[PDB]
Scaffold this active site. Structure first.
Site, mmCIF file in Angstrom:
data_model
loop_
_atom_site.group_PDB
_atom_site.id
_atom_site.type_symbol
_atom_site.label_atom_id
_atom_site.label_comp_id
_atom_site.label_asym_id
_atom_site.label_seq_id
_atom_site.Cartn_x
_atom_site.Cartn_y
_atom_site.Cartn_z
ATOM 1 N N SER A 244 84.767 5.050 -55.520
ATOM 2 C CA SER A 244 85.549 3.982 -55.414
ATOM 3 C C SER A 244 86.378 3.883 -54.332
ATOM 4 O O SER A 244 86.193 2.932 -53.579
ATOM 5 C CB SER A 244 86.401 3.834 -56.842
ATOM 6 O OG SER A 244 87.042 4.991 -57.084
ATOM 7 N N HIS A 274 81.207 7.472 -63.143
ATOM 8 C CA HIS A 274 82.346 7.401 -62.134
ATOM 9 C C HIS A 274 83.585 7.213 -62.901
ATOM 10 O O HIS A 274 84.845 7.812 -62.621
ATOM 11 C CB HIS A 274 82.151 6.666 -60.834
ATOM 12 C CG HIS A 274 83.581 6.566 -59.742
ATOM 13 N ND1 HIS A 274 84.154 7.807 -59.952
ATOM 14 C CD2 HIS A 274 83.970 5.614 -58.964
ATOM 15 C CE1 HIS A 274 85.175 7.437 -59.199
ATOM 16 N NE2 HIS A 274 84.978 6.311 -58.644
ATOM 17 N N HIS A 320 84.465 21.464 -63.724
ATOM 18 C CA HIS A 320 83.870 21.169 -62.268
ATOM 19 C C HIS A 320 83.912 22.058 -61.145
ATOM 20 O O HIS A 320 84.648 23.100 -61.386
ATOM 21 C CB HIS A 320 85.000 19.487 -62.122
ATOM 22 C CG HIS A 320 83.983 18.430 -62.162
ATOM 23 N ND1 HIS A 320 83.209 18.011 -61.112
ATOM 24 C CD2 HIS A 320 83.548 17.560 -63.180
ATOM 25 C CE1 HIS A 320 82.460 16.979 -61.349
ATOM 26 N NE2 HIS A 320 82.673 16.782 -62.703
ATOM 27 N N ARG A 329 97.184 17.646 -62.200
ATOM 28 C CA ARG A 329 97.400 16.417 -62.990
ATOM 29 C C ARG A 329 97.149 16.786 -64.341
ATOM 30 O O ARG A 329 97.788 16.275 -65.064
ATOM 31 C CB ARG A 329 96.211 15.422 -62.528
ATOM 32 C CG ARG A 329 96.274 15.007 -61.085
ATOM 33 C CD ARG A 329 95.304 14.215 -60.391
ATOM 34 N NE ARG A 329 93.914 14.665 -60.687
ATOM 35 C CZ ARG A 329 92.714 14.611 -60.270
ATOM 36 N NH1 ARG A 329 92.684 13.293 -59.495
ATOM 37 N NH2 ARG A 329 91.609 14.905 -60.515
ATOM 38 N N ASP A 375 90.813 14.378 -66.618
ATOM 39 C CA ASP A 375 90.243 13.345 -67.422
ATOM 40 C C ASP A 375 90.245 14.201 -68.871
ATOM 41 O O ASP A 375 89.821 13.528 -69.793
ATOM 42 C CB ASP A 375 88.924 13.063 -67.065
ATOM 43 C CG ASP A 375 88.785 12.203 -65.793
ATOM 44 O OD1 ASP A 375 89.754 11.424 -65.723
ATOM 45 O OD2 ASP A 375 88.307 12.473 -64.925
HETATM 46 O O1 LIG Z 1 85.039 12.361 -57.741
HETATM 47 C C1 LIG Z 1 86.277 12.538 -57.228
HETATM 48 O O2 LIG Z 1 86.007 13.399 -56.016
HETATM 49 C C2 LIG Z 1 87.556 12.488 -57.761
HETATM 50 C C3 LIG Z 1 87.514 11.520 -58.965
HETATM 51 O O3 LIG Z 1 86.843 10.392 -59.074
HETATM 52 C C4 LIG Z 1 88.277 11.523 -60.215
HETATM 53 O O4 LIG Z 1 89.456 12.444 -59.958
HETATM 54 O O5 LIG Z 1 87.910 10.982 -61.295
#
Ligand SMILES: O=C([O-])CC(=O)C(=O)O
Ligand SMILES: CC(C)(COP(=O)(O)OP(=O)(O)OC[C@H]1O[C@@H](n2cnc3c(N)ncnc32)[C@H](O)[C@@H]1OP(=O)(O)O)[C@@H](O)C(=O)NCCC(=O)NCCS
Ligand SMILES: O=C([O-])CC(=O)C(=O)O
Lengths: 449, 448
Positions: A244, A274, A320, A329, A375
């Site tokens: 994005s 995404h 990740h 976060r 998330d």
């Molecule tokens: O993909 C990334 O570098 C970060 C991202 O979109 C997310 O925090 O959802």
């Protein structure tokens, strides 16, 4: 307006610094470009500039150098709503643009600008929104409303009129103030028309940006106002490389205004790879509850975690590649949940996961990161307070991410970065030339300079 | 449909062949990524794959290995319309997709597909177009109309229901057929509403794609049909790295459908640095005309050239960000103009620019490319046949670019390329480490 007077001093300087860097460090090598990059979505290729935020493997994301805790709680705490705890996204936005922490007065100026401008969404934007069939996906509706507002672009107008490149950043700022004010109005309209019987609630002129979005969606509760303040703060920015953000910079680099660049960005965020992670984590949590007739025991979650990992699969929102600690976060959402909704059953599962899932990942020995991201935590916070419309989650994400995308687009037009035009390659050339090419970080590669 | 049968065999092969290249050759190095690349719009950086076309600096664009002269005139001439010379874009699309020259039957099958599906633009797309104020920029209207039609996305729907990764390319082709069919209808609607008193003309079921656009705009002369055919052929594709093609690939890479990726691309095409060149040239050419009371002499234009350059101005239509000799898209237009309008005043200035302006720009020595690109020629042609609405020129560009963008997106979802996700760097980091980094192509780099 303070923000603008300050930028009028900072930006000429940055502009000059960047011109020098490009001149004096431009041939400095950062890495090898490879066949695997070209066919591999450029993963790892340092092809982009972003100064708003920066991911460190050992700390997570920082916003202009400050950590989340510094801004949320610590010695550099950003202004709140009266009686509030959570940072006002408005203040973060001041930070992302200037690199300096705002005064209470600085935030109030931006809040007023936002509240005023929120009354200035064209009627025709709503006409555009109502003309789309109500079953259209909300992210399509969101992108379309934004784009229709391109008619109000100050940038596009002043460009056709003739303005100096030095004025780019000012026009971008005005457009950004307008667009950001509009976003919660467009989003709420979508929410209400699609999910709440097409009843429409006006902006409260005595509520900040985040609070107006919950209000106009039909959630007047102080906890909801706080949650949304935190949400918008957390998801504001995450470097320039995600789809994005990059879409936004890419379209920006052709001199297209913020309504064109950000709506383009939202067509990217709408992509399943995404913008759906939040939702998948939540559906997974809900599948655990229903599977175990309630919150599972410490032992059941381990067994279902082992079965999943051993069977090639991953646990959503954990592991990740990049970080080596818990996403800061995530931590801030945990602290919000503990304070505000600790007995919520789906939260208890997420909580249980924070204990159990990192332990099973370390023991499974594959992922150098056993820790969650943002998330993992967001979906249950929304569902608790009654926002249950999965498809709309991406729109909330979108409203947040506009803070970062606007910051970045203002900055890079201030720096006068040129158009993005990489070189593509053919599979033909590759096949003709592959054998002929040195393996990277190899002696042969060293041989060919 | 022959096209789809042909792809149903070629795509599983190319997919297997790409997976092999990523495994076997992934770690092969192409070049040094530098700090310059990050701050300089990735210029030169080999970051993308595109198989539809390739720009050879000392030859210009080739479409699946075939030159423009080959496809238009010479030994591999694509199907034309009945009685026509100019190649049909429908056949070029077949080429782009399959790597193979189409027959007459192949082309006819695609036209018929476009013509059928052109009746299938939803009523709500027109509601959306009409809800935008008529003074909205045409490229905003275009993008918005395309985006509204995302609701009819087969790919988005099949993805929600669960489909195999192997089915992707099929749902992308279907969507592309629908969208390509709609674009002329959306574009003409915009045109007629904005500029022609909001009277609307239906598709003609017996015309080809390009010619139908002309028809629906209100132009029915054979020479205009021929121009639109050529115009759409030339602007179809230009590698994967221009902003519109790249924006399409980027948004596509997150599994967003062609309505989303192409409307995003159009927002990029709308940018002054990408989509505006044709119009600047025409204005400039018309400015010369007015200034000299007609066609200038060699001397007048040679002088004017120099006075423009030495006053720090751009000569529009000359130089490119990659091209290095004469753009073969320029030569196709010049041919058309000598053939069809040799005596047009504005054309004669364009011609005269062709003799004089190269030699001037060599000596000035700032321009890396001294020769003309495609935008030097397109405006005078449009203007000559009465398409005088400058802002709409970018929409025409966009309709044509859709050919390459749909081809690229079908192919890449065939290959199963993953999401595009480069790494951004900060200025702070750059200031911290730059001195310690090796210069690209040094002894220090060779040691590291
Ligand atoms: O993909 C990334 O570098 C970060 C991202 O979109 C997310 O925090 O959802
Ligand atoms: C296409 C274009 C933008 C590429 O820019 P670029 O990649 O920066 O070009 P170069 O590598 O040749 O740049 C080297 C120098 O030549 C100059 N130059 C190139 N073409 C020029 C022209 N026609 N007139 C004047 N100066 C020119 C550039 O301004 C630059 O000088 P600078 O360092 O002071 O900025 C450029 O050729 C241009 O502005 N063309 C005119 C508009 C046009 O026809 N656009 C259509 C493009 S599809
Ligand atoms: O390729 C470019 O950079 C610009 C261009 O000519 C095109 O897109 O047709």
């Amino acid at each position: 307006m303070k923000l603008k007077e300050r930028l009028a001093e900072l930006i000429p300087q940055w502009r000059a610094e960047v011109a020098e860097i490009r001149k004096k460090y431009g041939n400095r090598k950062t890495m090898d470009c490879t066949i695997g990059h070209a066919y591999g979505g450029m993963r790892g290729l340092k092809a982009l500039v972003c100064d708003t935020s920066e991911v460190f493997p050992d700390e997570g994301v920082k916003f202009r150098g400050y950590t989340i805790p510094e801004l949320r709680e610590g010695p550099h705490k950003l202004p709140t709503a009266e009686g509030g705890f959570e940072p006002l996204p408005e203040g973060l936005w001041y930070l992302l643009l200037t690199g300096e922490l705002p005064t209470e007065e600085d935030v109030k100026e931006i809040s007023a600008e936002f509240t005023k401008r929120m009354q200035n969404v064209p009627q025709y934007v709503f006409d555009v929104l109502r003309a789309m069939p109500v079953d259209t996906h909300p992210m399509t509706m969101f992108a379309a409303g934004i784009l229709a507002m391109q008619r109000e672009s100050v940038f596009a107008k002043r460009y056709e009129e003739g303005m100096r490149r030095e004025e780019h950043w000012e026009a971008m700022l005005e457009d950004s103030l307008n667009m950001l004010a509009a976003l919660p109005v467009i989003a709420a309209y979508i929410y209400r028309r699609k999910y709440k019987g097409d009843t429409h609630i006006a902006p409260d002129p005595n509520l900040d940006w985040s609070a107006n979005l919950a209000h106009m969606m039909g959630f007047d509760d102080f906890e909801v106002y706080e949650l949304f303040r935190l949400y918008m703060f957390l998801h504001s920015d995450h470097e320039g490389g995600n789809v994005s953000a990059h879409t936004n910079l890419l379209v920006n680099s052709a001199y297209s205004d913020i309504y064109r660049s950000f709506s383009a960005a939202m067509n990217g965020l709408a992509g399943p790879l995404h913008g759906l992670a939040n939702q998948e984590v939540l559906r997974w949590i809900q599948m655990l509850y229903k599977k175990f007739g309630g919150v599972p025991t410490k032992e059941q979650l381990e067994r279902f975690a082992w079965d999943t990992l051993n069977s090639g699969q991953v646990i959503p929102g954990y592991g990740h590649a990049v970080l080596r600690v818990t996403d800061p976060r995530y931590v801030a959402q945990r602290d919000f949940a503990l304070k505000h909704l600790p007995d919520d059953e789906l939260f208890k599962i997420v909580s249980l996961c924070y204990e159990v899932i990192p332990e099973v990942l370390k023991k499974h020995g594959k992922a150098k990161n056993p820790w969650p991201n943002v998330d993992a935590h967001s979906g249950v916070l929304l569902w608790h307070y009654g926002i249950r419309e999965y498809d709309f989650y991406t729109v909330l994400f979108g409203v947040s991410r506009a803070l970062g995308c606007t910051a970045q687009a203002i900055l890079v037009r201030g720096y006068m970065l040129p158009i993005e035009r990489p070189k593509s390659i053919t599979t033909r050339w590759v096949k003709e030339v592959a054998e002929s090419l040195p393996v990277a970080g190899s002696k042969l590669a060293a041989a060919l300079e």
